[PDB]
Scaffold this active site. Structure first.
Site, PDB file in Angstrom:
ATOM      1  N   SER A 361       0.822  -1.205   0.000  1.00 15.92           N
ATOM      2  CA  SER A 361       0.000   0.000   0.000  1.00 15.92           C
ATOM      3  C   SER A 361       0.858   1.258   0.000  1.00 15.92           C
ATOM      4  O   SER A 361       0.537   2.236  -0.683  1.00 15.92           O
ATOM      5  CB  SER A 361      -0.944   0.003   1.200  1.00 15.92           C
ATOM      6  OG  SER A 361      -1.966  -0.963   1.056  1.00 15.92           O
ATOM      7  N   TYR A 364       1.767   3.502  -2.921  1.00 15.73           N
ATOM      8  CA  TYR A 364       0.808   4.433  -3.491  1.00 15.73           C
ATOM      9  C   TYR A 364       0.923   5.822  -2.882  1.00 15.73           C
ATOM     10  O   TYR A 364       0.078   6.678  -3.158  1.00 15.73           O
ATOM     11  CB  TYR A 364      -0.622   3.922  -3.277  1.00 15.73           C
ATOM     12  CG  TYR A 364      -0.958   2.586  -3.905  1.00 15.73           C
ATOM     13  CD1 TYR A 364      -0.017   1.868  -4.619  1.00 15.73           C
ATOM     14  CD2 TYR A 364      -2.225   2.039  -3.769  1.00 15.73           C
ATOM     15  CE1 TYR A 364      -0.319   0.647  -5.173  1.00 15.73           C
ATOM     16  CE2 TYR A 364      -2.541   0.821  -4.329  1.00 15.73           C
ATOM     17  CZ  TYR A 364      -1.582   0.128  -5.030  1.00 15.73           C
ATOM     18  OH  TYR A 364      -1.891  -1.085  -5.598  1.00 15.73           O
ATOM     19  N   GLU A 449      -4.308  -9.380  -1.691  1.00 17.21           N
ATOM     20  CA  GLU A 449      -4.926  -8.109  -1.345  1.00 17.21           C
ATOM     21  C   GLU A 449      -6.397  -8.344  -1.056  1.00 17.21           C
ATOM     22  O   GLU A 449      -6.993  -9.300  -1.562  1.00 17.21           O
ATOM     23  CB  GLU A 449      -4.735  -7.073  -2.458  1.00 17.21           C
ATOM     24  CG  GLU A 449      -4.833  -5.642  -1.979  1.00 17.21           C
ATOM     25  CD  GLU A 449      -4.329  -4.640  -2.991  1.00 17.21           C
ATOM     26  OE1 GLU A 449      -3.884  -5.060  -4.079  1.00 17.21           O
ATOM     27  OE2 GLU A 449      -4.376  -3.429  -2.699  1.00 17.21           O
TER      28      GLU A 449
END
Length: 474
Positions: A361, A364, A449
């Site tokens: 994550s 990002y 995910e």
DNA sequence: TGTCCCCCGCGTTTTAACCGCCAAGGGGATTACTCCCTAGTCTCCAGGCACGTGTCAGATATATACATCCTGTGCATGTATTG
């Protein structure tokens, strides 16, 4: 809203204003493209009357989008009627639509299409939240990022767009998705691509605008449009306010409408969160480290009633994004993708996306060496029963049949034996290890995910202030 | 290899060379002579040559300051295409 004058008209940027009459603001941008014949051109028109002296003018400027072009300034010595006539005549010539009834606009083939634009201090707050708000509420940085979204990465050369313009863009992406779904690369596909490139301004230099042929470019375009929407919401949120604030950021904070409380470094919560951050740094993202500088408690109004507390399998999962857009999330929470958006861009469907590995994550965040501050948000997500997916299938949402979330089965991932608890939520500590999921038919997903669909299944809980520390470069 | 023009072949037209002859007298050609200039002689000495001699102009590095050659390089520009 606030009506800016094009700065490029140096002879009139300081002495003149764009003309308005209620709804009707005499400012307009047109775009045309036809990859069949390789046209990709813009045309801006603006009626400006001087502020000081009574004199009206029509400014026209045209060229390839991105590359500034030929301009014309026609002065009228106050002949507002003639000037408005010229304006409307040219608008019709170039669009085949009358200007005054701009509301009912209908583009026609082989002519320009329209587009739509946006044109005694006691500062009582904790010092840490003060630094956080000033970091995220820095209007200068938002402007600079928007300028970078035009001259660094040419995604929106001419300027910004409206929510409804983005929606029309999504409509065109939907038409593109329908077309591509049948694998036919003939004339209709080229016209649909023309419609896409008309609605969203791109700059291809000279190389014929290429056909949108695979799913990857679809998804990239979708992410671009999402970033456009994000910038729009960020500028909408950062609207400044008067009325004796003595610290306008306090009103901006009200606009967040989300309690954010400083945590002590020695608290169990702070140490455990640091443990979770560190233990779950994927080994294949080793170009940088991350340090937990500070940790804030999150209390977003209305979310408590919405949480699916009844559902089992509750875990704390990461969500990363650039430093600037976080202002929107803290005010509005996370949203499912735009319905009008094409489904086939999301290899496992729409919804809200979370990881349990910090670095995946964290990728990002797009933090930088010069700009080393990023945020990661942790949310409690009630995944319930997961649907298991081995291979990409954008239609995962139909396969739920009673389940509440989807799991994409990655090669590397923590095993539940190491899981701990925080306030009755499951905290999935690492390290990552092999999970014995493999594919004797196709590829294998690199990392798991988890995706949820009901927005009510997410409850933001802590916001992490993170120093991304990069290393030697040569 | 190609160009083109200029030189060749030839008949023509015009001119003055040529042919045959005559005539004038300047000067070439002949003769004689005479004198002065040079040959011939002899004498004398200094100019000129062989031999010495010393130094500085030039010969020998030597280092040096260009001048030159040579190659590479970056660039204003010619072309393409579009608003």
């Amino acid at each position: 809203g606030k009506a800016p004058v094009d700065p490029e008209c140096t002879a009139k940027v300081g002495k003149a204003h764009v003309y308005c009459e209620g709804n009707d603001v005499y400012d307009v941008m047109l775009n045309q493209t036809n990859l069949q014949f390789n046209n990709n051109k813009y045309y801006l028109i603006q009626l400006l009357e001087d502020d000081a002296q009574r004199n009206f003018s029509v400014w026209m400027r045209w060229g390839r989008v991105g590359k500034m072009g030929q301009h014309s300034l026609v002065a009228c010595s106050g002949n507002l009627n003639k000037a408005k006539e010229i304006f409307q005549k040219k608008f019709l010539d170039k669009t085949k639509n009358n200007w005054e009834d701009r509301e009912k606009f209908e583009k026609v083939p082989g002519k320009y299409d329209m587009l739509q634009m946006d044109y005694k201090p006691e500062s009582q707050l904790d010092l840490r939240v003060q630094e956080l708000i000033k970091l995220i509420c820095n209007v200068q940085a938002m402007e600079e990022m928007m300028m970078e979204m035009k001259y660094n990465t040419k995604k929106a050369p001419l300027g910004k767009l409206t929510v409804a313009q983005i929606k029309a863009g999504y409509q065109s992406l939907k038409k593109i998705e329908d077309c591509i779904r049948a694998g036919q690369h003939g004339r209709a596909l080229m016209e649909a691509c023309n419609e896409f490139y008309t609605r969203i301004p791109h700059d291809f230099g000279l190389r014929t605008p290429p056909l949108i042929r695979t799913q990857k470019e679809l998804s990239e375009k979708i992410q671009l449009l999402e970033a456009l929407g994000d910038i729009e919401i960020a500028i909408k949120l950062v609207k400044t306010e008067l009325q004796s604030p003595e610290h306008p950021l306090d009103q901006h904070y009200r606009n967040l409408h989300c309690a954010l409380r400083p945590l002590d470094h020695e608290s169990y919560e702070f140490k455990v969160i640091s443990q979770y951050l560190q233990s779950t740094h994927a080994p294949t993202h080793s170009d940088y480290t991350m340090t937990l500088l500070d940790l804030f408690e999150v209390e977003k109004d209305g979310e408590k009633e919405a949480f699916r507390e009844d559902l089992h399998n509750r875990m704390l999962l990461w969500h990363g994004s650039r430093m600037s857009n976080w202002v929107g999330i803290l005010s509005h929470g996370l949203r499912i993708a735009p319905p009008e958006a094409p489904i086939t861009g999301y290899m496992f469907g729409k919804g809200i996306y979370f990881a349990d590995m910090s670095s995946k994550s964290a990728n990002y965040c797009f933090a930088s060496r010069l700009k080393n501050t990023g945020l990661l948000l942790l949310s409690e997500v009630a995944l319930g029963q997961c649907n298991e997916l081995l291979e990409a299938n954008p239609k995962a949402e139909g396969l739920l049949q009673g389940k509440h979330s989807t799991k994409g089965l990655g090669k590397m991932a923590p095993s539940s034996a190491h899981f701990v608890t925080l306030n009755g939520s499951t905290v999935p500590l690492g390290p990552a290890s092999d999970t014995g999921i493999l594919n004797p038919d196709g590829y294998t997903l690199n990392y798991n995910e988890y995706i949820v669909y009901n927005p009510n299944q997410v409850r933001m809980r802590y916001l992490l202030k993170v120093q991304f520390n990069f290393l030697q470069l040569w």
